[PDB]
Amino acid sequence: SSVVVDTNGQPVSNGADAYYLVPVSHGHAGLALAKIGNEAEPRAVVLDPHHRPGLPVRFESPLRINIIKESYFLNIKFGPSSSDSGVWDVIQQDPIGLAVKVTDTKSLLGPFKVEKEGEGYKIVYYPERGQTGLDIGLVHRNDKYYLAVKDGEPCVFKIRKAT
């Protein structure tokens, strides 16, 4: 499968560089952490008009290669490669369904792939590595756009090297 490219047409690096996920619609918005309702710490990933560019991410595969392809299962995380926190996971959370949230552990192979969609890319979540995955889209609740499983309604991004 194809090499994933940033907004300058360069291969997206495996962990070494961070990237903004820039929505192609939803006007201007960037990635942020929010509370869902009641939790003490904001750990739900949202797209927030008030946080542009937002929190950049790193895409990680345990394969030896220094670039990412659309075929690779990925961990995606906020923060440095060295830090255990910021790792995205998909969690059952009552208002949202299956919400994208940050965690501080990480499996050998991550839950996600980055796949070509429209003018850019979508994030796809894989309950099971040998089966079709489920598009990540946006769930609007409580004055926030939560990144959440919403198959058929993917949020489309371009990937801008945080440089």
UniProtKB/Swiss-Prot annotation:
GO molecular function terms noted in the UniProt entry: serine-type endopeptidase inhibitor activity
Highest taxon of the lineage: Eukaryota
GO CC entries: extracellular region
Pfam families in the cross-refs: Kunitz_legume (PF00197)
Location of the protein in the cell: Secreted
Keyword field: Protease inhibitor, Secreted, Serine protease inhibitor
Temperature optimum or stability note: Thermolabile.
Keyword Secreted part of the UniProt annotation: yes
Keyword Secreted: yes
Homology family: Belongs to the protease inhibitor I3 (leguminous Kunitz-type inhibitor) family.
Assembly and oligomerization: Monomer.
Function: Inhibits bovine trypsin, human plasma kallikrein and plasmin and weakly bovine chymotrypsin.
Protein name: Kunitz-type serine protease inhibitor BbKI
Species for this entry: Bauhinia bauhinioides
